[PDB]
Design an enzyme around this catalytic site. Structure first.
Site, short mmCIF file in Angstrom:
data_model
loop_
_atom_site.label_atom_id
_atom_site.label_comp_id
_atom_site.label_asym_id
_atom_site.label_seq_id
_atom_site.Cartn_x
_atom_site.Cartn_y
_atom_site.Cartn_z
N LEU A 25 -24.63 -1.36 -5.53
CA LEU A 25 -24.58 -1.42 -3.68
C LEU A 25 -24.22 -0.59 -3.21
O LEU A 25 -23.06 0.22 -4.22
CB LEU A 25 -23.66 -2.92 -3.78
CG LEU A 25 -24.31 -4.17 -3.73
CD1 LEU A 25 -23.46 -4.86 -3.52
CD2 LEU A 25 -25.31 -4.08 -2.58
N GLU A 32 -17.09 -7.91 3.03
CA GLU A 32 -18.64 -9.17 2.79
C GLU A 32 -18.75 -9.35 1.44
O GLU A 32 -19.51 -10.71 2.05
CB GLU A 32 -19.58 -7.19 3.29
CG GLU A 32 -21.02 -7.76 3.89
CD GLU A 32 -21.34 -8.53 3.10
OE1 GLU A 32 -21.97 -8.65 1.57
OE2 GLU A 32 -22.43 -9.11 3.57
N1 LIG Z 1 -27.79 -5.41 0.06
C1 LIG Z 1 -27.92 -6.66 -0.50
O1 LIG Z 1 -27.39 -7.81 -0.51
C2 LIG Z 1 -28.66 -6.49 -2.53
C3 LIG Z 1 -28.94 -5.35 -3.19
N2 LIG Z 1 -29.82 -5.55 -4.50
C4 LIG Z 1 -30.07 -4.50 -5.05
O2 LIG Z 1 -31.12 -4.76 -5.71
C5 LIG Z 1 -31.51 -4.03 -6.08
C6 LIG Z 1 -32.37 -4.75 -7.16
O3 LIG Z 1 -33.82 -5.39 -6.56
P1 LIG Z 1 -35.25 -4.95 -7.76
O4 LIG Z 1 -34.74 -3.95 -8.01
O5 LIG Z 1 -36.17 -5.60 -6.59
O6 LIG Z 1 -35.15 -5.51 -8.75
P2 LIG Z 1 -34.72 -8.00 -9.11
O7 LIG Z 1 -32.98 -8.30 -8.70
O8 LIG Z 1 -35.35 -8.47 -7.78
O9 LIG Z 1 -35.24 -7.75 -9.69
C7 LIG Z 1 -36.28 -7.43 -9.91
C8 LIG Z 1 -36.77 -8.25 -11.81
O10 LIG Z 1 -36.33 -9.38 -11.51
C9 LIG Z 1 -37.33 -10.31 -12.39
N3 LIG Z 1 -38.37 -10.93 -10.91
C10 LIG Z 1 -38.23 -11.10 -9.58
N4 LIG Z 1 -39.23 -11.04 -9.12
C11 LIG Z 1 -39.68 -11.86 -9.25
C12 LIG Z 1 -41.19 -12.99 -9.52
N5 LIG Z 1 -41.33 -13.45 -8.60
N6 LIG Z 1 -41.64 -13.50 -10.46
C13 LIG Z 1 -40.92 -13.16 -11.53
N7 LIG Z 1 -40.10 -12.05 -12.24
C14 LIG Z 1 -39.66 -11.55 -10.65
C15 LIG Z 1 -37.48 -9.52 -13.30
O11 LIG Z 1 -38.38 -9.45 -13.84
P3 LIG Z 1 -38.50 -9.30 -15.04
O12 LIG Z 1 -37.80 -9.59 -16.21
O13 LIG Z 1 -40.56 -9.68 -15.21
O14 LIG Z 1 -38.62 -7.46 -14.98
C16 LIG Z 1 -38.46 -8.32 -11.61
O15 LIG Z 1 -38.56 -6.67 -12.47
C17 LIG Z 1 -29.79 -2.95 -7.21
O16 LIG Z 1 -30.10 -1.78 -6.63
C18 LIG Z 1 -29.59 -4.19 -6.40
O17 LIG Z 1 -27.81 -3.86 -6.41
C19 LIG Z 1 -29.30 -6.92 -5.20
C20 LIG Z 1 -29.14 -8.10 -4.26
C21 LIG Z 1 -27.95 -8.02 -2.73
C1 LIG Z 2 -14.50 -11.61 -6.80
C2 LIG Z 2 -15.53 -11.33 -6.14
O1 LIG Z 2 -16.42 -12.17 -5.46
C3 LIG Z 2 -18.08 -11.21 -6.31
O2 LIG Z 2 -18.01 -12.06 -7.00
C4 LIG Z 2 -17.88 -10.36 -6.10
C5 LIG Z 2 -18.50 -9.49 -6.53
C6 LIG Z 2 -19.11 -8.11 -7.43
O3 LIG Z 2 -19.30 -7.41 -6.63
C7 LIG Z 2 -21.09 -7.23 -6.42
C8 LIG Z 2 -21.62 -6.06 -7.08
C9 LIG Z 2 -23.05 -5.41 -6.47
C10 LIG Z 2 -23.90 -6.83 -6.10
O4 LIG Z 2 -25.33 -6.61 -5.93
C11 LIG Z 2 -26.32 -7.28 -6.66
C12 LIG Z 2 -23.13 -7.56 -5.83
C13 LIG Z 2 -23.88 -8.82 -4.93
C14 LIG Z 2 -23.51 -9.17 -4.32
C15 LIG Z 2 -22.31 -8.65 -3.35
N1 LIG Z 2 -22.87 -8.58 -1.75
C16 LIG Z 2 -23.78 -9.24 -0.93
N2 LIG Z 2 -23.19 -9.46 -0.15
C17 LIG Z 2 -25.14 -10.36 1.09
N3 LIG Z 2 -24.37 -10.61 2.38
N4 LIG Z 2 -26.04 -10.76 -0.16
C18 LIG Z 2 -26.04 -10.83 -1.53
N5 LIG Z 2 -26.72 -11.14 -2.09
C19 LIG Z 2 -24.81 -9.87 -1.59
C20 LIG Z 2 -24.77 -10.30 -3.27
C21 LIG Z 2 -25.93 -10.18 -4.06
C22 LIG Z 2 -21.87 -8.42 -5.96
#
Ligand SMILES: NC(=O)C1=CN([C@@H]2O[C@H](COP(=O)(O)OP(=O)(O)OC[C@H]3O[C@@H](n4cnc5c(N)ncnc54)[C@@H](OP(=O)(O)O)[C@@H]3O)[C@@H](O)[C@H]2O)C=CC1
Ligand SMILES: CCOC(=O)CCCOc1ccc(OC)c(Cc2cnc3nc(N)nc(N)c3c2C)c1
Length: 206
Positions: A25, A32
């Site tokens: 992130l 958050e």
């Molecule tokens: N701001 C937010 O709330 C969040 C942000 N993030 C960020 O998102 C980024 C990650 O996103 P992204 O790169 O798209 O990665 P994802 O976590 O979606 O993982 C992508 C990978 O997960 C598998 N996958 C995902 N979708 C499918 C599907 N439909 N079917 C089968 N396998 C699947 C992997 O499989 P394979 O093993 O086949 O390669 C594919 O390459 C990071 O920067 C992370 O920090 C993540 C969560 C929340």
């Molecule tokens: C003791 C503290 O509690 C914990 O367990 C969190 C510690 C992990 O720190 C993180 C670093 C990177 C990261 O990207 C994956 C996430 C996951 C995350 C964070 N905000 C998030 N916020 C929102 N609104 N949504 C999400 N889907 C989300 C998601 C997946 C967490």
């Protein structure tokens, strides 16, 4: 025997739909994260005698989370990947798709099982959000909107807050958000580390 529950997507995103950078992130927001943990953990009191929520995530999100924090505590975790496997895991569920995950959960957590499923959350990343957005059971997005065009290299896949999507996705009243999440939620702009953000809930009719 597979489609008995709606999915909810939970995400923190910029006004440019940015969600990530350098497989992490690009912000650091403790409160958050605490919201994410509360929303993904909340089970109404009567149900919570055996109920657990489920967090579904892609493999790159799985790896993104600091090893200290995995699996995500008190929730059933499932890592979605096309390549089975493991990820080395203590109890750690794996599935090759969103529907194979649901099938695995219903088989594993049945009427007879001691642990039951309450709500199911897709928690990222972009590729799994894309699958969830195309899934006929997704009806809800818990979005944290971050009012800064922070530079990101991964983006949310569908502009659900924009005019083109506004007949389908509707933002709910804050009192409805609070109700759904089971608690008072701060309403309006919150400032940590130099950015404003705010909590929203959006829904789609099935
Ligand atoms: N701001 C937010 O709330 C969040 C942000 N993030 C960020 O998102 C980024 C990650 O996103 P992204 O790169 O798209 O990665 P994802 O976590 O979606 O993982 C992508 C990978 O997960 C598998 N996958 C995902 N979708 C499918 C599907 N439909 N079917 C089968 N396998 C699947 C992997 O499989 P394979 O093993 O086949 O390669 C594919 O390459 C990071 O920067 C992370 O920090 C993540 C969560 C929340
Ligand atoms: C003791 C503290 O509690 C914990 O367990 C969190 C510690 C992990 O720190 C993180 C670093 C990177 C990261 O990207 C994956 C996430 C996951 C995350 C964070 N905000 C998030 N916020 C929102 N609104 N949504 C999400 N889907 C989300 C998601 C997946 C967490």
């Amino acid at each position: 025997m597979n489609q008995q529950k709606s999915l909810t997507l939970i995400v923190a995103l910029t006004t440019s739909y940015g969600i990530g950078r350098s497989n992490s992130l690009p912000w650091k927001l403790k409160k958050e994260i605490s919201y994410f943990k509360r929303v993904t953990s909340f089970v109404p009191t009567f149900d919570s005698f055996e109920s657990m929520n489920v967090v579904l995530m892609g493999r790159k999100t799985w790896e993104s989370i600091p090893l200290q924090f995995r699996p995500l505590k008190g929730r059933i975790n499932v890592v979605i990947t096309r390549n089975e496997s493991l990820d080395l895991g203590n109890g750690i569920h794996s599935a090759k798709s969103l529907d194979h995950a649901l099938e695995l959960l219903y088989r594993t957590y049945g009427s007879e099982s001691s642990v039951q499923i309450n709500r199911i959350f897709v928690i990222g990343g972009a590729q799994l959000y894309k699958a969830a957005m195309d899934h006929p059971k997704l009806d809800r997005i818990m979005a944290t909107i971050i009012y800064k065009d922070i530079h990101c290299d991964v983006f949310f896949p569908l502009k659900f807050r924009d005019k083109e999507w506004s007949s389908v996705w509707k933002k709910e009243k804050h009192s409805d958000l609070e109700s759904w999440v089971g608690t008072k939620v701060p309403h309006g702009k919150i400032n940590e580390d130099g950015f404003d953000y705010e909590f929203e809930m959006w829904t789609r009719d099935l």
